[PDB]
Amino acid sequence: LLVGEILSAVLSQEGINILTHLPKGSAEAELMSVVPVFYVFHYLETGNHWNIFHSDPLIEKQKLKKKLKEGMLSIMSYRNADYSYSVWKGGSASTWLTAFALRVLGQVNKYVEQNQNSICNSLLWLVENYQLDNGSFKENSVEARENSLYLTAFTVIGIRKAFDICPLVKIDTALIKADNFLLENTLPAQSTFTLAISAYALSLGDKTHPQFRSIVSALKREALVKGNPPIYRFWKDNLQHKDSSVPNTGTARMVETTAYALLTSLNLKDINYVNPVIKWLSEEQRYGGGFYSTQDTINAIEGLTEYSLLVK
């Protein structure tokens, strides 16, 4: 299976073997510990692969649900009184981290129900204190647009993953405004990374918008391939006209960009286009299931899991 590494690693109660250093006691480290447990539960439940266990299906499902629930309680330790989240307990709030927590909790809600009011509070904190008038998001106190495009896309991903839990008009409006910022400022692109994160974020909303389809086509025109017809397909983080070389080895930003390209394409149901992409991702995966860093790892695992549910 494509999801074999994380499945084996989660069932063994071991780490997924991400290469990068995650500082002890950081919110990101705790969020990344629950990440692989969710995608496993999500694969087994949605794909109906409790058959895998020949012992007791109901007992094993409960055992994973407990681990999932223990991860939730740990994440809550980083929550502030205003329902924002901090990277370190007692440190200042981060819009980025709050958006990352909403993505994880929004996804986990599917199988372990979150406190609806708590999620609402976090979403409203995010939208009312850190969205600018132009619809972009800012963090707590050419290069500016790139930073704004990144954080907005990243924040939109978090909001979209938690939206159905708290579909308030203030939040709906914030998404409309944030999506419009991305639609208006993504092309002409400055990097494939920023283009890819914008594309994936927009793919979680209105997939019929004409400028979303131009953004996606611009991303597809940055594709690197091996073979004729392509056996592998992937993306690097810099645009061809800025750096026209071909890469010799993998990087974190390469896997992350590729992952966002994959997730965008799966949301458009483009199953023919994706097979060479998963092939490449499958070979970049390490023993354990992790990749280079946290964000390339989360999105790559999501891509592999959603592909496996769509195809098998």
Partner: peptide, 15 residues
Amino acid sequence: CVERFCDVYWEYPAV
């Protein structure tokens, strides 16, 4: 030999 980086090319070459 890491075959996935052997003979990689741009799918839509600029030139």
